[PDB]
Design a protein around this ligand. Sequence first.
Ligand code: SF4
Ligand code: SF4
Ligand code: FCO
Ligand code: F3S
Ligand code: MG
Ligand code: NI
Lengths: 544, 262
Amino acid sequence: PTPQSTFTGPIVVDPITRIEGHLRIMVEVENGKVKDAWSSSQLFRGLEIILKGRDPRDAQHFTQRACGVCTYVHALASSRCVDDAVKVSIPANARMMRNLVMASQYLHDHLVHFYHLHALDWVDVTAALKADPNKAAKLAASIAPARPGNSAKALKAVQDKLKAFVESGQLGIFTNAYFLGGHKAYYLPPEVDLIATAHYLEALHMQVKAASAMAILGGKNPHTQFTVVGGCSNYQGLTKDPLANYLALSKEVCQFVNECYIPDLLAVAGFYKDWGGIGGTSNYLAFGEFATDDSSPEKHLATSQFPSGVITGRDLGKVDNVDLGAIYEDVKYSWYAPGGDGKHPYDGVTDPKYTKLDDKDHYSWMKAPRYKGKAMEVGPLARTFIAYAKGQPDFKKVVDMVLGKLSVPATALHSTLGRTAARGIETAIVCANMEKWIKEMADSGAKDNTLCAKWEMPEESKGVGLADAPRGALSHWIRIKGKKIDNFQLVVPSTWNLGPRGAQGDKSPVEEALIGTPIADPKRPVEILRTVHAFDPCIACGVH
Amino acid sequence: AKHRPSVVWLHNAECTGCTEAAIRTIKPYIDALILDTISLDYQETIMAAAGEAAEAALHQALEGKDGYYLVVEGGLPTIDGGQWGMVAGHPMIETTKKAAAKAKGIICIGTCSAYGGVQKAKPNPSQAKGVSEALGVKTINIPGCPPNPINFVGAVVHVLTKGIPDLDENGRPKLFYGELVHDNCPRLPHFEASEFAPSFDSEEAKKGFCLYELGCKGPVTYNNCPKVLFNQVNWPVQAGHPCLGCSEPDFWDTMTPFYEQG
Ligand code: SF4
Ligand code: SF4
Ligand code: FCO
Ligand code: F3S
Ligand SMILES: [Mg+2]
Ligand code: NI
């Protein structure tokens, strides 16, 4: 069964590595299972304060620097936000180009997260040294598509490289790893460790290509520079050779998704099937992404191909529409001044006030976003459940493939394993849509290259920009007064997932998911990392 | 086994775009760099250890017998005793100061570590500062938001193999930052002919006219973007968008409004 100590006491993990940003996790453990949790974000920058009084056209450039991991997404949400505030409807080519860049972001973001951020929670790299490479080649044939990268020779070269590295005594990023000397929570056969380690290294190269693809349309990566109020600036991105290169590069990236990412995810998921009973939450939210109609926030919600919705209490039979008026943020357990509870983002307040480390009354730089009083999990799992509930055919098919491979019910996805699985599921689906989406823009841009619409700065207005970023439901909210930024508020997916308690004292999604986490070894609490990493935390995003 | 030079990489007030930019290197790729060239001994984004195990990894590196080079990503928030930016219960200013003290060299990757960056923009609620200001020591600055990995990895290899490269007045290697963006821009002939796009929807824009009237800061920005490109494919002005001047100190305040020259 699942290894579990008899440990009773506190565990603090700070820093949480292999995330973006600065997170401290505090838990109380009783008899080897987590009984209470706190998600404590440790950096404030204050972009919303910085934005006040500025030109609304500048917003996207400041807010993109909320995060370099989910690069682009904030420039996009800010652009959608200001487009809405000035009431301009972007041209078709701009919708298409903006959406493809998001699709590119998903591919790069999710590949890097699985291999370079999450995998080391499940894969013992040093155990790969014990594998026989011929036995590993055989096993690779039985869990994944045939590929030369999975040959005995290829897997030996990886093993030899790893061996020479370990024997040098400079373990670099593997220094003091939780798997060193073995660990009861690490289940994989050495051969699977070897296989995944080869892909880890391959993935370091593949992500370069995924970023290059994105940069053809985005101008550069990280931090794209192609969006403007009224659409996009990149006329070159509608032309033939750049689109052929973008398709060619996207197809390499997707071949790697299908040959390596999904099969490694499924292999890991098969060995860690017990993680289907750990780390579940109840409520899910998505604003949707990949809309056919982005003329307004309402059209986005209604036409997103990855649909929007609200699920509550795991009830897959009742996907509610998103009520943007029902979103608010609490500050009661956060490092902000008193009086700031229950604020809709149009009326958001960001008034920093620190107390002290591990003050249970005020313990995070994140606000606590709530929806009609409820915490909401956002991200790939939220999107996957909403699409599945709604019978979106790509999700129904891929989810069913996953449930069939694992021989598990759909309820098993309400867990850390499901959260991890959902991230791959939607990456496979983005991949299967790339060519159709690329052809739509190629053909459209051939016929007419309109990319940016005319618009006028209002004296006073407000607007909202919605996106489902790789980590989930993202919204930027502006008030314009005297043609300047009067208020600008970001509510970001990691704020939804990893923020603290709201005004009712109610745990956020990560805090709730942490309850019942078993700890095989309190010295080396990988189980905390597993669940926290599955939410794909971005603390610079969460706090801004 | 030949000894590989120890690199300690700290993250303070940052978006992690600099880390992301570094791993876009292709000469060499990042795996070859850390397997063959350097010993990357602390790096919160990708390191296996967490919590107390990661803190101990840091302290082993800082106490290494052969010494280490320091990379700093992010500015330093100094308000409130440094407590608005903490790692392992320690103010980031404190840990950077400590790591910097015995560092063989300090490279600031990004405008944030170099100059203070986005969190330093008015009204700077965290009292963020650049590393050199906060510590009172000279730094090798690889600015940009983010810098090109060519520039960062170039500096690193240069420092380990040749010494400190020649720096300009803002601490930047002349190899990469010696030339204005503008002087290498393919739209230069348009700038010279006073052929400027009045808007992004204009026919002038469609024809690739100069973006100066739309706020391009290329003429006052030092970087090698048009010469080296990003991701082997593109750069902002090629994507039809003005330069923000993102490698210049305090650009958040000196180069705004971004769509104007005012
Ligand atoms: S310089 Fe720019 S990309 Fe680098 S950490 Fe700062 S905000 Fe992020
Ligand atoms: S587009 Fe910018 S860098 Fe290029 S010629 Fe015009 S002002 Fe100079
Ligand atoms: N994805 C992503 Fe970043 C977070 N949380 C944003 O938005
Ligand atoms: S915005 Fe920055 S990346 Fe180059 S083109 Fe201008 S210096
Ligand atoms: Mg906010
Ligand atoms: Ni992010």
